[PDB]
Design a protein around this ligand. Structure first.
Ligand SMILES: *[C@@H]1O[C@H](CO)[C@@H](O[C@@H]2O[C@H](CO)[C@@H](O[C@@H]3O[C@H](CO[C@H]4O[C@H](CO[C@H]5O[C@H](CO)[C@@H](O)[C@H](O)[C@@H]5O)[C@@H](O)[C@H](O[C@H]5O[C@H](CO)[C@@H](O)[C@H](O)[C@@H]5O)[C@@H]4O)[C@@H](O)[C@H](O[C@H]4O[C@H](CO)[C@@H](O)[C@H](O)[C@@H]4O[C@H]4O[C@H](CO)[C@@H](O)[C@H](O)[C@@H]4O[C@H]4O[C@H](CO)[C@@H](O)[C@H](O)[C@@H]4O)[C@@H]3O)[C@H](O)[C@H]2NC(C)=O)[C@H](O)[C@H]1NC(C)=O
Ligand SMILES: *[C@@H]1O[C@H](CO)[C@@H](O[C@@H]2O[C@H](CO)[C@@H](O[C@@H]3O[C@H](CO[C@H]4O[C@H](CO[C@H]5O[C@H](CO)[C@@H](O)[C@H](O)[C@@H]5O)[C@@H](O)[C@H](O[C@H]5O[C@H](CO)[C@@H](O)[C@H](O)[C@@H]5O)[C@@H]4O)[C@@H](O)[C@H](O[C@H]4O[C@H](CO)[C@@H](O)[C@H](O)[C@@H]4O[C@H]4O[C@H](CO)[C@@H](O)[C@H](O)[C@@H]4O[C@H]4O[C@H](CO)[C@@H](O)[C@H](O)[C@@H]4O)[C@@H]3O)[C@H](O)[C@H]2NC(C)=O)[C@H](O)[C@H]1NC(C)=O
Ligand SMILES: *[C@@H]1O[C@H](CO)[C@@H](O[C@@H]2O[C@H](CO)[C@@H](O[C@@H]3O[C@H](CO[C@H]4O[C@H](CO[C@H]5O[C@H](CO)[C@@H](O)[C@H](O)[C@@H]5O)[C@@H](O)[C@H](O[C@H]5O[C@H](CO)[C@@H](O)[C@H](O)[C@@H]5O)[C@@H]4O)[C@@H](O)[C@H](O[C@H]4O[C@H](CO)[C@@H](O)[C@H](O)[C@@H]4O[C@H]4O[C@H](CO)[C@@H](O)[C@H](O)[C@@H]4O[C@H]4O[C@H](CO)[C@@H](O)[C@H](O)[C@@H]4O)[C@@H]3O)[C@H](O)[C@H]2NC(C)=O)[C@H](O)[C@H]1NC(C)=O
Ligand SMILES: *[C@@H]1O[C@H](CO)[C@@H](O[C@@H]2O[C@H](CO)[C@@H](O[C@@H]3O[C@H](CO[C@H]4O[C@H](CO[C@H]5O[C@H](CO)[C@@H](O)[C@H](O)[C@@H]5O)[C@@H](O)[C@H](O[C@H]5O[C@H](CO)[C@@H](O)[C@H](O)[C@@H]5O)[C@@H]4O)[C@@H](O)[C@H](O[C@H]4O[C@H](CO)[C@@H](O)[C@H](O)[C@@H]4O[C@H]4O[C@H](CO)[C@@H](O)[C@H](O)[C@@H]4O[C@H]4O[C@H](CO)[C@@H](O)[C@H](O)[C@@H]4O)[C@@H]3O)[C@H](O)[C@H]2NC(C)=O)[C@H](O)[C@H]1NC(C)=O
Ligand code: SIA
Ligand code: SIA
Ligand code: SIA
Ligand code: CA
Ligand code: CA
Ligand code: CA
Ligand code: CA
Lengths: 388, 388, 388, 388
């Protein structure tokens, strides 16, 4: 009943414990599970849920054929109970579209879905489950947004959008919403050169977003937002531990204010927690594809262009498929600090597994522990052969 | 806890944004989805839902064979969560029958279902989910009602019924309900010559209904209701932009007080928003069948017999099937105006697609934006070949 | 939050309107619907639900084979939302067993299930969804109860049980429960000679039960209960309109205090409303089997041994299968009188349809109207051929 | 809203009445039922539910192949409504892992799941459905816990864990949790020599746990916990009525302070109620495998090394498969005493039924009656042949 404020710092991250896993593809082999992609996790004050973009068909369904495609009239943002699979019968539609974000401000939830043809897309901003504001495409080239949760502070929920080229300069805007209405927007500033799919978290009245430079950068761009002043900066992770994909091999020195070169015109949504010595980066293990997943403790990664790992944890073996990853936290938990969490999208089917005609995913997520916990690996677990 | 009053005017309609879409036929190819038709949308103060007449069988079920037929003992009014499909497991039965309307008065919901043989039908009026009032057929020829939501003002919810011929003069009545009890009824007056399937909305203490003249009219009849005085008038949309189906080609001058001729004994449920220069009409694109769907801004359409479009938006391409369309609004939303909404029934199967033995539909709906949003088209999306 | 009292009389019954219908067998041909039998309907202060004895298997399931049998370890009393089918996913288990009753006292619900072998059965009485009291078999021969709702008055809910022979004198007891605890019990008194499966309703502080005399009677026995004094009487319906099944042809004079002879050792659960001139009897249309169903207005049927029909309504044609029927009312509805309701079990499969290996049913129910409504017939609607 | 205290003694157990049964394997032959094992039952103040470790696949699913294995990344603790089957659509995930316990303290629920490889497992302790505390493996050999409900007293919920060998001395710890945080832990003391899978209940401010000595004991070890002092003792059931499995034949004298020999390196989770003359033991009927199940009244079993049965009740015939059994009670029921309950896991499939490639189970549970009720037997009820 009052707006949430980011009054706490991050808990110390000494390892990662298992939080949730839906085993959707394993289960959906023989039950009514929706084909998805672009998932995430987001908490309300009373409940945490799984989120994703449905493809408007079950996995066993004949309409799963062609679901490699990102943008259709049959997609929607759905949410469902934590660690359940997204089924026809338990999935709640938040809004219609093929690009989304969502966050609760402490009183109620804002959800945003973009739909339309590539040259004529529009965002609709829902708040308390009703449509409130609409935004038309400004650059007429796939208006698109975070594909993970936004973050609010005292009613103000910033959202990062991009419109324009995926392979050249584009038009990125930071919208500051309150109760679904636009308080303000700004064009992207700072030294980030291309921005897509920001993964965001909040601590001590600052919102940090780790994004995807699709055009040039194999290091990740970072936007930091003041939700009170409604201003931001941008730079890159300085660290030579490179965290996009595909990417070249790790160098010994990164770049703070420019894209690290070697791979153009591609990437993956990812995330980091940037908190001095309490800094952890996620990446795919493979430099070539969305294969494997690990967390690496890289003290001062944001600001230190020679920073290297001092600790890590494998999440998904490099013999298993991964995908998008992103940040969320339970802002309404007990205690004196915010516990960092993330999810990894485990993509199955096309293009890497082309014996099936579909593309889908399941979800695994972890949150930080102050203990030094033993590690397991967490694969999707499905046998593609069963779907043949 | 107090009755809702229609105290607001319509928001300015500059375009239409996507509101909901269930993709029911695509999803029901491989999950337990009920065969429906005659759908709509209706809001409670805390939730908006999809409504339809079930056929008492799933689409993949063997009993889907024969579901082209409108009236059986196996039909029921169901509701289900917004943009979900109507499944066996998530569908809530409101009442039993093969013709319906439903609306919330601010305290609770009235639902009405008609059932029976053609010569002996009866309406039962439910209120707070209990049966309260029953009305026997007065003309012994398919007693029937709106197939979309009614509208309430201070407890009074008017409903339009027709009994008698579909191809000649019939007996239309306006019932004024309060808490499921009949306050008053009136025979149809004014210049409308035949009335079926009224699509209604409320603003500034007046209820406007756009209906179907099955007997003669390719222009649409309009009933306007004073829910305080409990009186009404009727006329036709004056505009030469004709909005029934099938229909002849658009002339340059309409008819205000008589059916526009050229097509007899057929039609489709449709709707309009009639608000001076803020006037928008829906129609099928095809003049021959329930094919395509568009919205047209036709300033003063109700009163101007030469009024032509000044703006439009395509909803469904003329290469895709449509069906019934109707009006609803979220009377419990925030802000200073009521945002116009509509749904379009996307009919699949018989009679236009006769390689399957069933008839069903899915739903798409939009609400107005004050922005000038880019347009997409929104087809059902299912492949009939998959059902073979 | 206070116990309900039977303070109202019955509304005048001038006809019957459709209340609910689940079409379970039609729908369960292609969805996960539980095999049932012995259904009924019962209201809470906020909701009315369908009830039945599950067979612990879906209809399409391989374990549906053998479900003609009444008593197994796999049966349970389930409830589910009104007019929904009893599915695996929406059915709530009230208790485990193969004979049951259930009723809400205004504060919470009592449910009773009997289980065990024929010579060693026991009742467990649940209240507020916890087990409170248990009763062991007294005659060691299929302890059994109403198979429809009980009725409460000021916390006191009487229940009729029988233990002993189905084809000879047996031991019937009336238990008076309050908060799941036994206040009192009595052996059956009066002139009823055999009692099974009582169908009960309450009005003006009296509970009337119409039961089944399996041993000799083709007229129905009647128990009337004073829930304050905790006493009862019994007799038969005097009327020559005979309402058990199988039965001989209607005579011109009935029997008030003895079974009407002609058929031994068989019957069906049925019901009546006995209210002077406002008296209505249900029966199968067939005198030979559970085929068809009609309601007949038989003024003074209880006390007049020459009383004949003055009005009727067909519910199920004699070309369609019926089954058990029983009484319930919504004691928590608005208004000045209790509206009589009933359900009819529509049995499909064995023994009358032996091309399938299962026995199941669906449900239709009606409540009274003060109007003289037109009639329809309400068959199960499924095609057995589809299940082959 | 206040913590529950164990203020009541056990009700007198004169027999056992049926409480719940899900018939999961019968139903899951033709519906979307999760493969499980290691089930139990646990009550909240407003609801009692079924619990189990999912295998992350339906029974009919192709991924059911290999589900004999205990520990995978696809397992999770789920709960679901009492006597329902654990379906994809009604199962709520409590936490991720392959060993668990759960209990409500009167304000909210603590749930604990262990996951990881054998040499590197970790417990995560959830409270109010959020992760609060994590515990790393201390002996690097399958950290594991009760597989049935824990018990709380004034906020303090003790839990028994074991880490180390299954076939030799191991490291057992008693953790005392409050609001998901560790108040204290102790190493196992007393004369119990090996501890696994404790089944616990609470009465008069003492918690009694009956466990599994996998290494040597065919009598069962017993831990008794003071949740105020946060101390414990351990011994064995003195009785010569031996209750593990496999086991040698019953002798005439047991052992109070040492394992009863004859079978090494195997066992089954089981339980007892130890209350002077009101003492009842469960066991499999078979001495060789998890076949059959009975309850035996063995006055002073805990302390009397010659105690023999004075009464019993068969639960599952020795011609039917059983499995794990464990204790729970409804601490929030009415009345002056706690009513003892238990469940039995009915295992189907591998290894005893190897014509199928899966292992799963269903559940039956009973609670005590003060009556001397007639007995039935309660088999799983499924036909394996149907799954072929
Ligand atoms: C039970 O569970 C536990 C808990 O999980 C398990 O214990 C864990 O074990 C894992 C696996 O070993 C550990 O993860 C690795 O962590 C290291 C970081 O720790 C080493 O380095 C630390 C930093 O050392 C510099 O500074 C220090 C001072 O600050 C200085 O002292 C030192 O000399 C040095 O100059 C050391 O502090 C650390 O020592 C503490 O911990 C030790 C245990 O780990 C202990 O033995 C010590 O005594 C001490 O007390 C230790 O030496 C990460 O570096 C590593 O991440 C690299 O390697 C993996 C493959 O294993 C790779 O996937 C990673 O990406 C990463 O390497 C790439 O990136 C580098 C950076 O650019 C690059 O240099 C590398 O060449 C490499 O590059 C190639 O691969 C990448 C990726 O594909 C590609 O992009 C490139 O282009 C290129 O192709 C792992 O994260 C956990 O930290 C550890 N956890 C704990 C709590 O201990 C335990 O094993 C389990 N038990 C069992 C029985 O299974
Ligand atoms: C990005 O998204 C945006 C947003 O959606 C897209 O932009 C939209 O584009 C669509 C498609 O073009 C537009 O819909 C059409 O709108 C016109 C109405 O606008 C024209 O006419 C206006 C009125 O002009 C008279 O009065 C004015 C003064 O008031 C006077 O100035 C004028 O000279 C004239 O005498 C003009 O004001 C308007 O101009 C503004 O907008 C222009 C952009 O549209 C801009 O360029 C201008 O400079 C200006 O600023 C404009 O000229 C509708 O008329 C039209 O509806 C007709 O045609 C479609 C087929 O396209 C048909 O399906 C419709 O039913 C309708 O036509 C039938 O009915 C008529 C009425 O009886 C009849 O006369 C016709 O012959 C026709 O009849 C046949 O078909 C029917 C139906 O099957 C049948 O029943 C008959 O029997 C017969 O067989 C469209 O609705 C949107 O308005 C526009 N939206 C916005 C915000 O701009 C943009 O394209 C997308 N971008 C990309 C790159 O894709
Ligand atoms: C639109 O919908 C409406 C609303 O539903 C439809 O209108 C309804 O139509 C149905 C079907 O006709 C009616 O049901 C029958 O009702 C009669 C009772 O009403 C007749 O008798 C009344 C009593 O008359 C004695 O007393 C009066 C004075 O009190 C005296 O005046 C009279 O001369 C006589 O001596 C009359 O009052 C009544 O007249 C009012 O209504 C008339 C319309 O119905 C109207 O025309 C009149 O002018 C007047 O105003 C009328 O004459 C029931 O008797 C009958 O039930 C018998 O027959 C059916 C087969 O049809 C059978 O299944 C029943 O079981 C029952 O008969 C068996 O039992 C008898 C009792 O033992 C026995 O005598 C019979 O031989 C028979 O026995 C065989 O069958 C049974 C069962 O299988 C077996 O067990 C035996 O062994 C043996 O084999 C029907 O219920 C509705 O009442 C009527 N409703 C309304 C509101 O009007 C309308 O039709 C629909 N419109 C269209 C176009 O479809
Ligand atoms: C209707 O429903 C009701 C309610 O359920 C049914 O009635 C019930 O019927 C069942 C089945 O008969 C009963 O269960 C058995 O109970 C006996 C215990 O009761 C006998 O013993 C009592 C104790 O007697 C010593 O002390 C007393 C004084 O305290 C002294 O007087 C006496 O002489 C003696 O020295 C007697 O008090 C008791 O008498 C009361 O009740 C009688 C009715 O039962 C009545 O007739 C009497 O007049 C009196 O009023 C009675 O004589 C258990 O011992 C027995 O459990 C053994 O046998 C089963 C097989 O049946 C086996 O599975 C069990 O494990 C157990 O036996 C193994 O363990 C023993 C202990 O180590 C060992 O000694 C045995 O050799 C045996 O060992 C082999 O098997 C095991 C297991 O596989 C293996 O591990 C070993 O290695 C080895 O291979 C049953 O539980 C219910 O108690 C009774 N309930 C009630 C309320 O009456 C009624 O039948 C149903 N009606 C119908 C028509 O179906
Ligand atoms: C009660 C009833 O039968 N309504 C049906 C109406 C009437 O036939 C017409 O309005 C003529 O009166 O229209 C439909 O057939 C149609 O056109 O798709 C569907 C609808 O179910
Ligand atoms: C407890 C029990 O078995 N009840 C069964 C009763 C009894 O057999 C009779 O009332 C004779 O006592 O009737 C049925 O068989 C029936 O006629 O369809 C169904 C019901 O399940
Ligand atoms: C954590 C774990 O693996 N628990 C497993 C235990 C252990 O193997 C034993 O208690 C030996 O320690 O027992 C089972 O195998 C069994 O006997 O059915 C099932 C259970 O899943
Ligand atoms: Ca990149
Ligand atoms: Ca027409
Ligand atoms: Ca009889
Ligand atoms: Ca053992």
């Amino acid at each position: 009943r009052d707006f949430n404020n980011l009054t706490k710092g991050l808990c110390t991250i000494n390892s990662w414990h298992i939080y949730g896993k839906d085993n959707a593809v394993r289960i959906g082999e023989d039950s009514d599970v929706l084909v998805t992609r672009e998932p995430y996790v987001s908490c309300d004050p009373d409940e945490c849920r799984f989120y994703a973009l449905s493809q408007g068909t079950t996995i066993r369904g004949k309409h799963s054929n062609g679901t490699i495609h990102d943008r259709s009239q049959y997609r929607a943002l759905i949410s469902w109970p934590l660690s359940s699979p997204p089924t026809v019968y338990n999935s709640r539609v938040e809004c219609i579209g093929w690009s989304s974000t969502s966050c609760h401000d402490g009183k109620t939830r804002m959800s945003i879905c973009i739909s339309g043809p590539n040259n004529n897309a529009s965002a609709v901003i829902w708040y308390n489950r009703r449509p409130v504001t609409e935004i038309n495409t400004w650059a007429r080239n796939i208006l698109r947004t975070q594909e993970s949760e936004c973050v609010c502070h005292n009613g103000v929920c910033p959202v990062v959008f991009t419109d324009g080229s995926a392979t050249g300069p584009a038009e990125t805007r930071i919208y500051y919403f309150k109760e679904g209405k636009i308080l303000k927007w700004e064009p992207l500033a700072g030294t980030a050169k291309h921005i897509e799919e920001c993964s965001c978290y909040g601590e001590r009245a600052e919102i940090t977003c780790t994004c995807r430079d699709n055009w040039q950068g194999s290091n990740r761009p970072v936007i930091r937002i003041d939700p009170v002043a409604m201003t931001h900066t941008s730079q890159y992770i300085c660290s030579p531990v490179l965290t996009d994909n595909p990417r070249p091999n790790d160098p010994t020195v990164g770049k703070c204010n420019d894209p690290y070169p070697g791979n153009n015109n591609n990437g993956v949504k990812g995330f980091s927690y940037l908190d001095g010595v309490n800094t952890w980066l996620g990446r795919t293990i493979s430099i070539a594809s969305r294969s494997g997943y690990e967390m690496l403790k890289v003290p001062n990664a944001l600001t230190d262009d020679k920073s290297k790992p001092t600790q890590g944890q494998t999440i998904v073996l490099n013999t298993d498929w991964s995908g998008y990853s992103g940040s969320f936290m339970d802002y309404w938990a007990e205690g004196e600090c915010y516990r960092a969490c993330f999810y990894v999208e485990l993509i199955r089917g096309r293009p890497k597994e082309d014996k099936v005609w579909w593309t889908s995913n399941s979800i695994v997520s972890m949150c930080s522990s102050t203990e030094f916990l033993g590690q397991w690996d967490w694969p999707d677990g499905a046998k593609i052969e069963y779907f043949l």
